[PDB]
Design a protein. Structure first.
Length: 457
């Protein structure tokens, strides 16, 4: 039962690269997985990886004593602006363990309670925007979610107000950031990056990094002009010592983590929120039940921390939006030693493996036959999901540090949304998923009718 591995078509020197020469590479990998099964080899010029789609292979991948986080090419290029921040550093880089030890406390339950007020502040700004639209007017979903989540990481993390709801155009940071990630996406499909032909692209990349470093500058400046102003994530970056050594972070690493958390703390959550709303409006029973639960639980003018915790059905909706379209759809791993996966595929020390999460999430042997159906009632019982069947937040010590932050935000927001408005899919919208690294619905528009429920000062 040692088997040889499936591969899609190669094309000489270009290997499998041409199969992923689209703006949607993940969705295309998904389609290759449907043809080829639970594992395929995937080559590009000098770099192999193997894409895994089934729970039974992925649970072995997720054994930490056999595999460790790999930087995929995407994360490798991303190092050019996020450096050795928590997302783009090797497990064995000194700064991974150090910053993880320093910053973990900032995502505890005490820290979540502390972030809560400022989460509401922004969420209230969202509702007010929507209350304030005229009759003829509609809502751009991903755009406002993006405004909401960026402002939330910024305020709760750093006490910096992007004021996205004061703007009709995306914030400068966003513009630069998307373009920097866009470049990152674009380099992945160049056969010859060397070619002098991409000259203002390389220059345009540098401009956008500098713009990100521009914003980071202001944040360390605004904080230099106060300090009492609050106690948050930035404080901990500046003042926290690594209990394992006594050392705090150095300034260079701190610029990296700030960039890392503004990026990773807004993009994925933003797509989760649009997806969830996409699914509510396509599925009347869920919409209705979410509204029933919001009305039942959100009894004070703004939500409390304890009240967001009580929104179980919203939790279920969120998990089922993440099942179907996990907004960070992939993470990379390499074998720490020669090892044999599912007793069928011998791997060499250093061989790379890719977890294809939307396929993992579509694994019939684990999830049942109705995997394409959006059915949040399948999450009624959380302990019934088998180990490593559900992984939108990655794996082990390298899993999402901001997981609770993300779910708390999206639960609160989605709850408030269904408390205050009815939603109409007035264009009968067709799902279109734009990929940067993360996933998000494109062109998703709705109309809200206000339930006209006052919203506390
Ligand atoms: C629902 C939204 C989110 C999703 C689906 C998501 C998903 C993920 C995934 C899949 C990973 C592992 C990546 C890998 O193994 O290469 C990760 C890591 C990480 N996430 Fe998130 N994330 C989300 C939101 C957030 C938020 C709100 C923050 C911060 C406020 C954040 C910060 C991080 C950090 C710092 C890491 C790297 C951890 C380490 O290796 O030490 N993420 N996330």
């Amino acid at each position: 039962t040692i088997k040889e591995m499936p591969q899609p078509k190669t094309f000489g020197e270009l290997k499998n690269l041409p199969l992923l020469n689209t703006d949607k590479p993940v969705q295309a990998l998904m389609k290759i997985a449907d043809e080829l099964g639970e594992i395929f080899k995937f080559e590009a010029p000098g770099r192999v990886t193997r894409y895994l789609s089934s729970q039974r292979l992925i649970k072995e991948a997720c054994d930490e004593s056999r595999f460790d986080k790999n930087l995929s090419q995407a994360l490798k290029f991303a190092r050019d602006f996020a450096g050795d921040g928590l997302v783009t550093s090797w497990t064995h880089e000194k700064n991974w363990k150090k910053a993880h030890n320093i910053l973990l406390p900032s995502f505890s339950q005490q820290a979540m309670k502390g972030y809560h007020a400022m989460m509401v502040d922004i969420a209230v700004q969202l509702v007010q925007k929507w209350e304030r639209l005229n009759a003829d007017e509609h809502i751009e979903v991903s755009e406002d979610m993006t405004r909401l989540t960026l402002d939330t990481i910024g305020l709760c993390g750093f006490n910096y107000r992007f004021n996205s709801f004061y703007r009709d155009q995306p914030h400068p940071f966003i513009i630069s950031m998307v373009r920097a990630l866009d470049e990152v996406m674009n380099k992945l499909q160049r056969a010859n990056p060397d070619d002098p032909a991409y000259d203002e692209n390389k220059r345009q990349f540098q401009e956008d990094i500098k713009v990100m470093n521009d914003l980071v500058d202001k944040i360390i400046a605004d904080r230099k002009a106060r300090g009492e102003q609050s106690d948050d994530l930035l404080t901990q970056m500046l003042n926290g010592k690594d209990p394992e050594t006594g050392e705090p972070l150095d300034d260079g690493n701190i610029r990296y983590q700030i960039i890392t958390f503004l990026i990773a703390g807004h993009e994925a959550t933003s797509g989760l929120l649009s997806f969830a709303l996409y699914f509510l409006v396509k599925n009347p029973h869920v919409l209705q039940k979410v509204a029933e639960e919001a009305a039942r639980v959100l009894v004070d003018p703004v939500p409390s921390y304890k009240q967001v915790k009580q929104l179980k059905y919203v939790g279920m909706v969120l998990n089922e939006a993440l099942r179907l379209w996990p907004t960070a759809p992939a993470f990379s791993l390499y074998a720490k030693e020669d090892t044999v996966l599912g007793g069928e595929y011998p791997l060499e020390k250093g061989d790379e493996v890719m977890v294809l999460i939307p396929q993992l999430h579509r694994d019939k042997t684990v999830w049942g036959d109705d995997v394409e159906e959006f059915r949040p009632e399948r999450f009624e019982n959380p302990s019934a999901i088998p180990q490593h069947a559900f992984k939108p937040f990655g794996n082990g010590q390298r899993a999402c540090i901001g997981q609770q932050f993300a779910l708390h935000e999206a639960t609160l927001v989605l709850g408030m949304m269904l408390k205050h408005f009815d939603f109409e899919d007035h264009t009968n919208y067709e799902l279109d998923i734009k990929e940067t690294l993360t996933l998000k619905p494109k062109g998703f528009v709705v109309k809200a009718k206000s339930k006209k429920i006052p919203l506390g000062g």
